[PDB]
């Protein structure tokens, strides 16, 4: 991989849409580094404050940015998070918003053991297309793409499409 310019990819979308499964499979099949922002925040303890209504530690967004910046500047990172407005715009060469039909998403999150309030908030997040709108507000329209993510076959299509995109980008940016 040495001395190749490599792209950064954002995988965003509501919890349950398949970002982690996709990012991990992409890392394995491309050699790009996969970063789960939730796991990173947990591992490096990047929390500040507690949201009492959602019942979750509040992400320290500045510290996440500081934690990742050097690595992002070096390129070749696939970032997975259910938020994107706080990342420096310069980080990402392409942004994929994974989408899952509400019925499918509900059953996924139900299986994850989400209670009613958490199920409702997340399901409304998807049905209101919150993350999609957040992505389009934060990044150039031409680099934001929605990906259906409802079944293994769509995961397969997404892996294939993005792996092909990575190859083309690398060719274009290492003349």
UniProtKB/Swiss-Prot annotation:
Segments for region (LID): 111-121
InterPro entries assigned: Adenyl_kinase_AK6 (IPR020618), P-loop_NTPase (IPR027417)
Pfam hit, one: AAA_18
Binding site for ATP: 16, 18-21, 112, 151
Subcellular locations according to the entry: Cytoplasm; Nucleus, Nucleoplasm; Nucleus, Cajal body
Keywords: ATP-binding, Cytoplasm, Kinase, Nucleotide-binding, Nucleus, Ribosome biogenesis, rRNA processing, Transferase
Cellular component annotations (GO), alphabetically ordered: Cajal body; centrosome; cytoplasm; membrane; nuclear speck; nucleoplasm; nucleus
Molecular function per GO: adenylate kinase activity; ATP binding; ATP hydrolysis activity; nucleoside monophosphate kinase activity
Catalysed reaction, written as an equation: AMP + ATP = 2 ADP; ATP + H2O = ADP + phosphate + H(+)
Domain of life: Eukaryota
Ranges where the record places region NMPbind: 36-59
A GO biological-process term: ribosomal small subunit biogenesis
Region annotation NMP: where it falls in the sequence: 36-59
Keyword Aminoacyl-tRNA synthetase: no
Tissues expressing the protein: Expressed in heart, brain, placenta, lung, liver, skeletal muscle, kidney, pancreas, chorionic villi and the central nervous system.
EC number: 2.7.4.3
Known role: Broad-specificity nucleoside monophosphate (NMP) kinase that catalyzes the reversible transfer of the terminal phosphate group between nucleoside triphosphates and monophosphates. Also has ATPase activity. Involved in the late cytoplasmic maturation steps of the 40S ribosomal particles, specifically 18S rRNA maturation. While NMP activity is not required for ribosome maturation, ATPase activity is. Associates transiently with small ribosomal subunit protein uS11. ATP hydrolysis breaks the interaction with uS11.
Subunit structure: Monomer and homodimer. Interacts with small ribosomal subunit protein uS11. Not a structural component of 43S pre-ribosomes, but transiently interacts with them by binding to uS11. Interacts with COIL (via C-terminus).
Family: Belongs to the adenylate kinase family. AK6 subfamily.
Protein name: Adenylate kinase isoenzyme 6
